[PDB]
CSV table of C-alpha atoms in Angstrom, one decimal:
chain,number,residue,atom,x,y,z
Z,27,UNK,CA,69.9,106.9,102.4
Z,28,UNK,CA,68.2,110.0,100.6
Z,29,UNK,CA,64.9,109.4,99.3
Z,30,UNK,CA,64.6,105.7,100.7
Z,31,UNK,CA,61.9,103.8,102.3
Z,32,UNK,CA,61.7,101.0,105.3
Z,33,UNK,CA,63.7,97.9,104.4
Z,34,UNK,CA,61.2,95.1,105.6
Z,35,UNK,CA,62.7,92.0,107.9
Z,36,UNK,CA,64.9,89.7,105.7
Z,37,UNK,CA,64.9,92.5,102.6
Z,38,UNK,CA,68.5,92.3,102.9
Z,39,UNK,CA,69.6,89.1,105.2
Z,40,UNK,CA,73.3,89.4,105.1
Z,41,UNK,CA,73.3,93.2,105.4
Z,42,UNK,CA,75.3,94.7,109.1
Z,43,UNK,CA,75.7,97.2,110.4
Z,44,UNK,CA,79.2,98.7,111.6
Z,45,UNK,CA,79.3,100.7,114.3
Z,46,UNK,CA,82.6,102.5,115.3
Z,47,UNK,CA,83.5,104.0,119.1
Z,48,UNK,CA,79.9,103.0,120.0
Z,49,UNK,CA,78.4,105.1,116.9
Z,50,UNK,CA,77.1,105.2,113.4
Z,51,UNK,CA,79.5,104.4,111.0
Z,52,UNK,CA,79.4,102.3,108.1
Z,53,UNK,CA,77.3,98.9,106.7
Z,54,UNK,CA,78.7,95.7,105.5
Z,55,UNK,CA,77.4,92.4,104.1
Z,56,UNK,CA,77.6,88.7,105.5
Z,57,UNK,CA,79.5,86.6,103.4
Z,58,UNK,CA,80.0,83.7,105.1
Z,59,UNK,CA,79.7,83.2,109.6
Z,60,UNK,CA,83.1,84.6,110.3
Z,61,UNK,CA,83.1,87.3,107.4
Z,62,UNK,CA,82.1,90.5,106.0
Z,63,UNK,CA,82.6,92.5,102.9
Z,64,UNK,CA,82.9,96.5,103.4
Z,65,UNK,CA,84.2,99.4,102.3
Z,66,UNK,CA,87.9,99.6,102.8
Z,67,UNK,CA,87.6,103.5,103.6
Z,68,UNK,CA,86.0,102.1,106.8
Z,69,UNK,CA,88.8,100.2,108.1
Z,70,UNK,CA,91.9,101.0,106.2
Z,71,UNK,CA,94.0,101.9,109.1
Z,72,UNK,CA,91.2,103.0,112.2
Z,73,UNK,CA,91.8,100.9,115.1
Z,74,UNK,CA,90.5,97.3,114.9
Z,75,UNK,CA,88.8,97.3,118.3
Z,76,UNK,CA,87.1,100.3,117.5
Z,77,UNK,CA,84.1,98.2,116.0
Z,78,UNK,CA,81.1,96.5,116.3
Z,79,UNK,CA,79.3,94.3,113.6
Z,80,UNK,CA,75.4,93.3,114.3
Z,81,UNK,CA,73.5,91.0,111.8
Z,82,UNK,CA,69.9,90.0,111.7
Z,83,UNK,CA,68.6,93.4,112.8
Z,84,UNK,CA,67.1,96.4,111.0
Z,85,UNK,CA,68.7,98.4,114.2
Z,86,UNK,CA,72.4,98.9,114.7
Z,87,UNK,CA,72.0,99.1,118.3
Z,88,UNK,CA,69.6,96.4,119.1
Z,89,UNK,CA,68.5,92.5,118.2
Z,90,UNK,CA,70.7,90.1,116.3
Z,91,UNK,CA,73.8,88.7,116.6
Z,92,UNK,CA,77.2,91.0,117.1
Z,93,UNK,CA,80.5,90.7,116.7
Z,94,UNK,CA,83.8,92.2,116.9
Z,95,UNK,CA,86.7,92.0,114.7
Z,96,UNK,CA,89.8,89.3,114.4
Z,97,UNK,CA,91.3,91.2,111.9
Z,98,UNK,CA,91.1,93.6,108.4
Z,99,UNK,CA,92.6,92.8,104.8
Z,100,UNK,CA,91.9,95.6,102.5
Z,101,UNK,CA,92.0,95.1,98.6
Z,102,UNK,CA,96.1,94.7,97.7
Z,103,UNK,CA,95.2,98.0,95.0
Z,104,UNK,CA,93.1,100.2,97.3
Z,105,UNK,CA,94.8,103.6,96.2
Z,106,UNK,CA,92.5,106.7,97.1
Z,107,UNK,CA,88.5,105.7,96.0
Z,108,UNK,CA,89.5,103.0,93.5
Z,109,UNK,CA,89.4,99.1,94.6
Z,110,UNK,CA,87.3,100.7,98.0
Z,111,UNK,CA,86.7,96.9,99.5
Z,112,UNK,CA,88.0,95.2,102.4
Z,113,UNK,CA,87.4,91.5,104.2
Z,114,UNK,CA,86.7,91.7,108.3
Z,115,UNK,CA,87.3,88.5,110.2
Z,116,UNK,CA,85.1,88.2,112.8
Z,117,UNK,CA,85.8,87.3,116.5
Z,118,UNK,CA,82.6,85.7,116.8
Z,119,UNK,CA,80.7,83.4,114.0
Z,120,UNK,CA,77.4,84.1,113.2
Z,121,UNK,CA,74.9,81.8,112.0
Z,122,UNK,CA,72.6,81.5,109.0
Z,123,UNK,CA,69.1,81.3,109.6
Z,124,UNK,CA,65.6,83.4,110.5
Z,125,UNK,CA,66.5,87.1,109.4
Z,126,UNK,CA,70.4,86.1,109.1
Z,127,UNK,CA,71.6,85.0,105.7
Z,128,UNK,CA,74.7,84.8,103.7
Z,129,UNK,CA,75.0,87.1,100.1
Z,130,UNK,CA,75.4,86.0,96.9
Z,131,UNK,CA,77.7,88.0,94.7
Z,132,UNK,CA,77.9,89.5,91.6
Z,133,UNK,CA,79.4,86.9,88.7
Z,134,UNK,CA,83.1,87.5,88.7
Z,135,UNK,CA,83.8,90.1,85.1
Z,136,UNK,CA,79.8,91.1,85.4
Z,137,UNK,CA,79.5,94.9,85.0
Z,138,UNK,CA,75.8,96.2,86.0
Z,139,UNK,CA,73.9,97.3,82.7
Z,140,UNK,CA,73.0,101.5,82.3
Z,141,UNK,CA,69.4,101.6,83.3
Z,142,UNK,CA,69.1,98.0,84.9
Z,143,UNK,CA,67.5,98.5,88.4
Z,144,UNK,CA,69.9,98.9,91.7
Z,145,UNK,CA,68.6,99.0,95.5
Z,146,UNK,CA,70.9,100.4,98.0
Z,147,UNK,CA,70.6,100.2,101.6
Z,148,UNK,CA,71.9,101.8,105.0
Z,149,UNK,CA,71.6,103.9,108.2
Z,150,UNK,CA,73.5,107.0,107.1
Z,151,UNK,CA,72.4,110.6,106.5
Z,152,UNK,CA,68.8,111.3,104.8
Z,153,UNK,CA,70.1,114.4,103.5
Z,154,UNK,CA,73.8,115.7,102.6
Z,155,UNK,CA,75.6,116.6,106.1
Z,156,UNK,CA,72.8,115.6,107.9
Z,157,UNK,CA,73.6,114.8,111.8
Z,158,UNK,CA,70.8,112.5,112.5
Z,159,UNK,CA,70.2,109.4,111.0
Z,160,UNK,CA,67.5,106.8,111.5
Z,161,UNK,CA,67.3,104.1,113.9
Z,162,UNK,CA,66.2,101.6,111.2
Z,163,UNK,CA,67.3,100.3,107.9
Z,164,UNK,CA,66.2,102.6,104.6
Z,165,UNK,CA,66.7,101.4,101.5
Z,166,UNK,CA,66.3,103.2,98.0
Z,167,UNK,CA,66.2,101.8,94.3
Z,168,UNK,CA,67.8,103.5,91.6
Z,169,UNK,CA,68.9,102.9,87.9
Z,170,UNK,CA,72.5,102.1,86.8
Z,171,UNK,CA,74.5,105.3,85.2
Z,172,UNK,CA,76.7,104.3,82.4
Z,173,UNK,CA,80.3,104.4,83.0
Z,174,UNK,CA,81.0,106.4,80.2
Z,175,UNK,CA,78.3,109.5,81.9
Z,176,UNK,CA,79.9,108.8,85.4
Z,177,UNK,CA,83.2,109.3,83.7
Z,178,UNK,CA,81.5,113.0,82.2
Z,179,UNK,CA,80.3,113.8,85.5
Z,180,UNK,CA,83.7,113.2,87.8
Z,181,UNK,CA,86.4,113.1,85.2
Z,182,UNK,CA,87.7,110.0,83.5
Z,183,UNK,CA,90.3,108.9,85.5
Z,184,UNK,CA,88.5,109.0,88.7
Z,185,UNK,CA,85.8,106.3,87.4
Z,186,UNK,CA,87.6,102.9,87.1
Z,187,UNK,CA,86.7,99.3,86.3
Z,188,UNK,CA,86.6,98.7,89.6
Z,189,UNK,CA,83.7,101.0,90.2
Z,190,UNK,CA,80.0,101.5,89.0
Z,191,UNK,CA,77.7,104.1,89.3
Z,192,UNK,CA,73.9,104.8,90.2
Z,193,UNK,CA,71.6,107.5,90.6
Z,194,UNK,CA,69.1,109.8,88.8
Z,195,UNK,CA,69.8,112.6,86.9
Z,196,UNK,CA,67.3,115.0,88.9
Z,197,UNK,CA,68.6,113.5,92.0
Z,198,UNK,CA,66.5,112.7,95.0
Z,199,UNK,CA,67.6,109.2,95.5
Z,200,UNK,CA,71.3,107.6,96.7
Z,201,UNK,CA,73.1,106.6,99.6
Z,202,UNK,CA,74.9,108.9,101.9
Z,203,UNK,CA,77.0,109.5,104.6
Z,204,UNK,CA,77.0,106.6,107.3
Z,205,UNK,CA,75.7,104.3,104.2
Z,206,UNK,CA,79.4,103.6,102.9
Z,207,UNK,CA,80.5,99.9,103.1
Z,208,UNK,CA,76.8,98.7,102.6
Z,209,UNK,CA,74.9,97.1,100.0
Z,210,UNK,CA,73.8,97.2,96.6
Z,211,UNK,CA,72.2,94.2,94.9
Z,212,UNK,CA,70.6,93.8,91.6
Z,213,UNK,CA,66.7,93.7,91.1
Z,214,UNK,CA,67.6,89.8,92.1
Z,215,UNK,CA,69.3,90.7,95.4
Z,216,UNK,CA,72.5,89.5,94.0
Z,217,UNK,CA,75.2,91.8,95.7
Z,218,UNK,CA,76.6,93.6,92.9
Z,219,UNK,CA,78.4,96.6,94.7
Z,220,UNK,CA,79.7,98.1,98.1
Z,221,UNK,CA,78.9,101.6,99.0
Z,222,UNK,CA,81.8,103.8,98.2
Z,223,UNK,CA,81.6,107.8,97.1
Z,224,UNK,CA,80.3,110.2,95.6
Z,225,UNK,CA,80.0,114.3,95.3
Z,226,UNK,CA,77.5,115.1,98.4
Z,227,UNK,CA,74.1,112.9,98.3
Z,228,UNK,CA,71.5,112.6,96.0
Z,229,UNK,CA,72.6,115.8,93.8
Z,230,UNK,CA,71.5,116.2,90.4
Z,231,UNK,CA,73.8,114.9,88.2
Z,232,UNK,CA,76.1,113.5,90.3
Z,233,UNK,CA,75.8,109.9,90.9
Z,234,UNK,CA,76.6,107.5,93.7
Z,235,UNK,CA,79.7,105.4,93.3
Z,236,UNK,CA,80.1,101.7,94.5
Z,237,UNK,CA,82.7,99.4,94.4
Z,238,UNK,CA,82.2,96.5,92.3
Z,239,UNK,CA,82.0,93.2,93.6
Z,240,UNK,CA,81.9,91.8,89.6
Z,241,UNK,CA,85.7,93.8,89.0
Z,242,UNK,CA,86.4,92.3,92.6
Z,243,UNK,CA,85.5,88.7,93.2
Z,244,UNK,CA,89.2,87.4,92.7
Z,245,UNK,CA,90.0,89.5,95.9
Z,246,UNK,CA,86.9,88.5,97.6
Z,247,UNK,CA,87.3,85.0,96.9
Z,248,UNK,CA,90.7,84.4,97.8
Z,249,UNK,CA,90.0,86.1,101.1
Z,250,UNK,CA,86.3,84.9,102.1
């Protein structure tokens, strides 16, 4: 996260964190105790033992409950960025309560409204390419770019309906590398999105990308 500040215990109670050959990697939300939503660009082919889950901390390496996976089902359409979600089956279930929780999506055919405000959270990079990244969670809140500008600023076939954008256009504020699979909710904490691309982090005019859990839910249901 670039331009974020400390998330505070239970800001974000179904938010993990994924950690891959014992490292940084991605984030993920808690749907349910034996399932969590990420980023299918985290998964999609990797090997399956490869990774660690850990909710109810802001630490990926500490505290909480871990877990790893049973197995990965990535979206049916995932096809370069677009339909960027997968479901993880976890070998071990993990229990609401305390710091732990369970998300609450985005209605199924919402689309988050230009200018509406987003907060996005993660233990990735605080700059572009940057090799350290923090111990605990960051989170940032940013307003929702129309489709239509995200579509002027990467080309209109590379912004689908299954995708929604966020940022400022100064920059100074979006998630980053080591932040992709994680959440972003509505000013509600509804989870409206999934961390997914973007051109670097936090450049002007340039927003982040997510994958939206509104365009997404029949996948997500079926699979939960």
């Amino acid at each position: 996260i670039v331009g974020g500040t400390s998330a505070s215990a239970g800001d974000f109670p179904f938010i993990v964190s994924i950690s891959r050959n014992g490292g940084p990697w991605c984030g993920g939300s808690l749907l349910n105790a034996n399932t969590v939503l990420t980023a299918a660009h985290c998964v999609s082919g990797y090997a399956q033992s490869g990774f660690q889950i850990r909710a109810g901390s802001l630490s990926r390496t500490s505290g909480g409950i871990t877990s790893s996976l049973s197995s990965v089902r990535v979206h049916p359409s995932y096809s370069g960025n677009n339909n960027d979600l997968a479901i993880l089956k976890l070998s071990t279930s993990i229990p609401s309560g305390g710091n732990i929780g369970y998300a609450r999506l985005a209605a199924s055919g919402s689309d988050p409204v230009a200018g509406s405000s987003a907060t996005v959270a993660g233990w990735g990079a605080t700059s572009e390419g940057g090799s350290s990244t923090p111990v605990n969670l960051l989170k940032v809140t940013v307003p929702i770019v129309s489709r239509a500008t995200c579509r002027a600023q990467y080309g209109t076939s590379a912004i689908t309906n299954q995708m929604f954008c966020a940022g400022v256009s100064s920059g100074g504020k979006d998630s980053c590398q080591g932040d992709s699979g994680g959440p972003i909710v509505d000013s509600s904490n509804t989870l409206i999105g999934a961390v997914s691309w973007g051109n670097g982090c936090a450049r002007p005019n340039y927003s982040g990308v997510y994958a939206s859990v509104g365009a997404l839910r029949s996948f997500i249901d079926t699979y939960a």
